[PDB]
RNA sequence: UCAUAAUAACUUCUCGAAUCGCACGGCCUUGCGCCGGCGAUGGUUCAUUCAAAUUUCUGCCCUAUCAACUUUCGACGGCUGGGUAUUGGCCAGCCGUGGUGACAACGGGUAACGGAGGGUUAGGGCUCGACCCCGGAGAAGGAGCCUGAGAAACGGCUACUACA
RNA sequence: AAACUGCGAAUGGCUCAUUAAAUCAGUUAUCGUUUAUUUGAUAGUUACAUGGAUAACCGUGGUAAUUCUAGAGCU
């Protein structure tokens, strides 16, 4: 239609942002960056709508101009910067660090992390091949390209990133018995152990997982994200992604409420 | 039919009124950018040769160099042409311009002095006007004053004086911030 | 297929980038390297027919010894027309469901595909075709296998 | 009822208040004075009028003497 | 030019090289002593400040 | 016939920084000498992001007083090129005689933009959808083009027709 | 201030005339292509610094008429 779009209509924004249908007609329209538009976490939504540090749009950019907030150790100054999975958000003046990770309902949640854990990351690998001059390289899920990798590393694996020097320090193979977290689909946010994998020539292979409570589910290969073999490397949020049914949630809700008061 | 005479050497210009046609007969049928002798204009013009630079039609349209016609023609003037100032990138507009052949129809001629004559003009060649700006680039400053490779080009720049409105304070000096 | 001659045209027919006039003779098992006929394997459990590797025909649209890759849907049908040159028409039949009357009706569509000289195709035979890039105005599929006759 | 609910902001220093507060709130407290301006249409009308002048638009009376 | 009348321009272009040579020598030593003065001022001041 | 590498050559032929701002520092042969930090703006190739253009499968209302249609001057396919960001009867030459149809083609009507969906209800249905969300098209009617990463743009230009 | 240079003005907003396998819906492909901007990597083959123009500005004009423009002098 004679060029690219630059506006986002409210009621068309991604659902997992939890935006009220009233109070305006438009949406933040995340800018282009390392993460897809459909599944990203704009910085203005995080600062203003979740932490509630900034009252409105005008004061949200006032914080950013002071270079107070940074992601992955580098300061970002645009309010609609697309953050995504595994990203580390650090605010030094207030003194806490955040990691963007899904809960069991398929949306981003606030998750405190310690300073010692806020200095590394991990990401799924997308492709491995030879570049210009014969130098091997690989690219991760957040558009990080690194030259001279370990020849044992193949596609679909995960690598631990220093995030200070951008160097791979250890990796996990993609095979049965690994611990994985889902990033897309209806089973979004669940955590399980890979049971076995079935492949179909012509694309769209599927993997079968198993929950901690002996529940079973399946997903496409593009939505499985290995985060460990045992004792996952990152710190999982509260609930650990067990996906209680609706019956237990109301049972747990009243039990917790009456026990406290 | 008025005449616009300019003196590039002295930087002076003047406008005169001419109503007698036989003095202007020798200008007819000449082309834009040609050489003509100013003798028929008057006794004071002896020894002068003039260059035809341009003119304006009676309706106000200007002369355009490169089109051979005594009448005026419609053209599709693009960017970089003479009588067109585009308002937008890539814009092309159709306009009308008058030819480069001198004729009785035009209202004003523009011409300049090429060679000085023995006599002087009362209001044109008896006065001079100074230049406005000196050189600003580094190499041009060196060439103007014939300095050597290392002669501190900073010290040789031209600086004028200006004073405030009514403060009663002393005037100060202004300099051109040498580039390169 | 039946082809009288291989070079029967204005130009000279040859596989691209297969060099044929070398002073020194070297014998190699590789298909295209030594200077002999080149061919590839399509995949998806499709086996190269014997006629392709040892034949002399030249075709730039055959999935074997050609410059076309097969990717997309795989379909089946019955041939109804074989009266063009290296092109056939297949008939596909299915059943459409009408919800109000709770029963089905018959429908059919016609498809055009490219047939290689490796196969020999007659009327009323079942074939398996694979999708490829547009080869003509109405040809987007290529013949892959000919099912045995009853 | 006899109950009322609102919002409150507490600032570290008076200078920090004027740096982050919107101007319209300052006028309410009396700290700052109001801005005097013309109507929205008059400002727009003047803006389009200056698109027909090129260079030193402040004074443009030099063309009054062309008619003599 | 408006900045300098004609007598100024030819006076500056026709200045004899001896005057120009003196100017270079006068300027080169002026900066050298200026640089040396700043060099000694800072090195001594940091010593007394550190001591007291 | 992928990534990448090597050899013989080629080109009105590219790119590989003559650009800008803060800090005032460190060496000794003390020369208006040498070295040194963090940013801005650019730059060749690969990757990513917002995309865009084409493309596979199946699905639309009434009408036979519409039963045969398509190829003058491409209608279906083969081959060598031309053109395009690329595939392609998209176009130019040469050679075959094909393609759709009673499982409703082809043509005529539509007080017809399509869809998510609105109204009315035992179940099965009937009817409406210009209109806040998504996709397409247009700026009085037709055609042509400049600039640019992106337009056959009209709060851009050129011509004819109709108005003024 | 002015003016040159860079970027945007191809998004929004309005309307339903044309359109009956066409638009469109769900589902595939690009091993058949272009891509400003954003993000991550990445290029050893006079020099202590090269050359001519032009606008703003000064000054002289034309036409009943327009966001029309002429010729002359600086950077
Ligand atoms: Mg695939
Ligand atoms: Mg290759
Ligand atoms: Mg071809
Ligand atoms: Mg038939
Ligand atoms: Mg309808
Ligand atoms: Mg209609
Ligand atoms: Mg509608
Ligand atoms: Mg209507
Ligand atoms: Mg209404
Ligand atoms: Mg109208
Ligand atoms: Mg542009
Ligand atoms: Mg349009
Ligand atoms: Mg138009
Ligand atoms: Mg309008
Ligand atoms: Mg418009
Ligand atoms: Mg920009
Ligand atoms: Mg633009
Ligand atoms: Mg629009
Ligand atoms: Mg309206
Ligand atoms: Mg870059």
């Amino acid at each position: 239609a004679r060029g690219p779009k630059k506006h986002q209509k409210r009621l068309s924004a991604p659902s997992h942002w939890l935006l009220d249908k009233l109070s305006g007609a438009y949406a933040p329209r995340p800018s282009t960056g390392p993460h897809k538009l459909r599944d990203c976490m704009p910085l203005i939504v995080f600062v203003r709508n979740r932490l509630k540090y900034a009252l409105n749009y005008r004061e949200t950019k006032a914080i950013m101009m002071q270079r107070l907030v940074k992601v992955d150790g580098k300061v970002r100054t645009d309010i609609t910067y697309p953050a995504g999975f595994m990203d580390v958000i650090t605010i030094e003046k207030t003194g806490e660090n955040f990691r963007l990770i899904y809960d069991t309902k398929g949306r981003f949640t606030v998750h405190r992390i310690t300073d010692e854990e806020a200095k590394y990351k991990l990401g799924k690998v997308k492709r491995v091949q030879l570049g210009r001059g014969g130098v091997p390289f690989l690219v991760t899920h957040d558009a990080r390209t690194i030259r001279y990798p370990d020849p044992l590393i193949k596609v679909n694996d995960t690598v631990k990133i220093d995030l200070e020097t951008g160097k791979i320090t250890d990796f996990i193979k993609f095979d049965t018995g690994a611990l994985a977290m889902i990033t897309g689909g209806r089973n979004m946010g669940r955590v399980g152990v890979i049971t076995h994998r079935e492949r179909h020539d012509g694309g769209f292979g599927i993997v079968h997982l198993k929950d901690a409570l002996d529940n079973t589910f399946a997903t496409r290969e593009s939505n499985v994200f290995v985060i460990g073999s045992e004792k996952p490397w990152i710190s999982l949020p509260k609930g650990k992604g067990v996906k209680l049914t609706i019956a237990e949630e109301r049972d747990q809700r009243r039990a917790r409420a009456l026990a406290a008061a | 039919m008025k005449l616009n005479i300019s003196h590039p050497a002295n930087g002076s210009q003047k406008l005169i009124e001419v109503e007698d046609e036989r003095k202007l007969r020798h200008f007819y049928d000449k082309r834009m950018g040609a050489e003509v002798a100013g003798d028929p204009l008057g006794p004071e013009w002896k020894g002068y040769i003039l260059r035809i630079t341009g003119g304006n039609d009676k309706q106000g349209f200007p002369m355009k160099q490169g089109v051979i016609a005594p009448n005026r023609v419609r053209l599709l003037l693009s960017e970089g042409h003479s009588c067109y100032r585009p308002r937008r990138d890539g814009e092309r507009k159709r306009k009308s311009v008058r030819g480069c052949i001198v004729g009785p129809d035009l209202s004003v001629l523009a011409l300049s002095i090429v060679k000085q004559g023995e006599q002087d003009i009362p209001g044109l060649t008896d006065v001079v006007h100074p230049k406005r700006l000196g050189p600003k680039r580094a190499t041009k400053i060196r060439r103007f004053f014939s300095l050597s490779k290392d002669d501190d080009v900073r010290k040789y720049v031209i600086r004028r004086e200006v004073q405030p409105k009514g403060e009663g304070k002393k005037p100060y000096t202004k300099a051109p911030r040498i580039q390169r | 297929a039946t082809e009288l001659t291989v070079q029967s045209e204005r130009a000279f027919l040859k596989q691209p980038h297969i060099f044929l006039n070398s002073k020194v003779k070297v014998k190699s098992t590789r298909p295209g390297k030594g200077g002999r006929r080149w061919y590839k394997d399509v995949g998806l459990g499709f086996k190269t027919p014997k006629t392709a590797i040892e034949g002399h025909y030249i075709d730039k649209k055959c999935p074997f010894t050609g410059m076309v890759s097969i990717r997309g849907r795989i379909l089946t049908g019955r041939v109804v027309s074989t009266k063009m040159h290296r092109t056939i028409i297949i008939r596909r039949e299915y059943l459409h469901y009408i919800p109000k009357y709770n029963r089905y009706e018959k429908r059919h569509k016609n498809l055009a595909a490219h047939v290689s000289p490796a196969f020999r195709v007659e009327e009323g035979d079942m074939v398996v075709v694979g999708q490829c890039r547009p080869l003509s105005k109405t040809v987007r599929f290529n013949v892959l296998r000919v099912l045995p006759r009853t | 009822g006899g109950k009322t609910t609102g919002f409150a902001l507490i600032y570290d220093s008076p200078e920090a208040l004027k740096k982050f507060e919107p101007r319209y709130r300052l006028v309410r407290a009396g700290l700052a004075a109001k801005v005097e301006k013309a109507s929205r249409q008059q400002r727009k009308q003047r803006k389009n009028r200056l698109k027909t002048l090129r260079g030193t638009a402040k004074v443009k009376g030099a063309k009054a003497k062309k008619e003599k | 030019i408006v900045g300098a009348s004609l007598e100024v321009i030819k006076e500056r272009r026709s200045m004899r090289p001896e005057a120009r040579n003196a100017a270079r020598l006068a300027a080169i030593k002026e900066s050298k002593e200026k640089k040396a003065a700043a060099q000694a001022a800072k090195k001594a001041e940091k010593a007394k400040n550190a001591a007291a």
Side-chain angles (χ1 to χ4, degrees), chain D:
Chain D
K3 207 166 84 166
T4 310
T5 292
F7 273 88
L9 287 177
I10 302 282
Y11 278 104
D12 296 334
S13 54
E15 307 80 350
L17 180 139
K18 312 212 174 179
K19 182 157 54 177
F20 296 108
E21 217 61 26
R23 181 163 188 81
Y24 76 99
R25 286 177 184 169
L26 298 187
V27 179
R28 283 186 189 165
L31 317 168
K34 65 178 72 66
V35 174
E36 191 40 73
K37 279 184 319 184
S39 44
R40 215 199 176 218
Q41 293 179 356
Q42 283 175 356
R43 276 154 35 198
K44 273 173 165 177
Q45 274 181 271
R46 149 178 198 94
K47 180 258 284 179
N48 282 12
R49 185 184 299 118
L50 272 70
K51 288 213 267 206
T52 62
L53 316 173
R54 175 155 219 271
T56 75
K58 300 294 187 291
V59 65
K60 290 312 212 192
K63 278 76 54 181
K65 64 186 179 296
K66 64 92 176 179
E67 205 266 327
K68 272 79 71 178

Side-chain angles (χ1 to χ4, degrees), chain A residues 67-92:
Chain A
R67 317 170 71 77
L68 301 188
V69 65
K70 79 182 62 169
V71 61
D72 287 345
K74 291 174 71 175
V75 65
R76 296 315 175 171
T77 183
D78 64 321
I79 53 175
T80 77
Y81 178 82
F85 198 41
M86 287 288 156
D87 267 347
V88 181
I89 295 180
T90 287
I91 308 187
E92 293 179 353

Side-chain angles (χ1 to χ4, degrees), chain A residues 58-70:
Chain A
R58 191 264 325 283
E59 290 158 5
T60 301
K61 83 192 305 184
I63 297 169
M64 299 264 195
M65 295 298 102
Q66 297 162 346
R67 317 170 71 77
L68 301 188
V69 65
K70 79 182 62 169

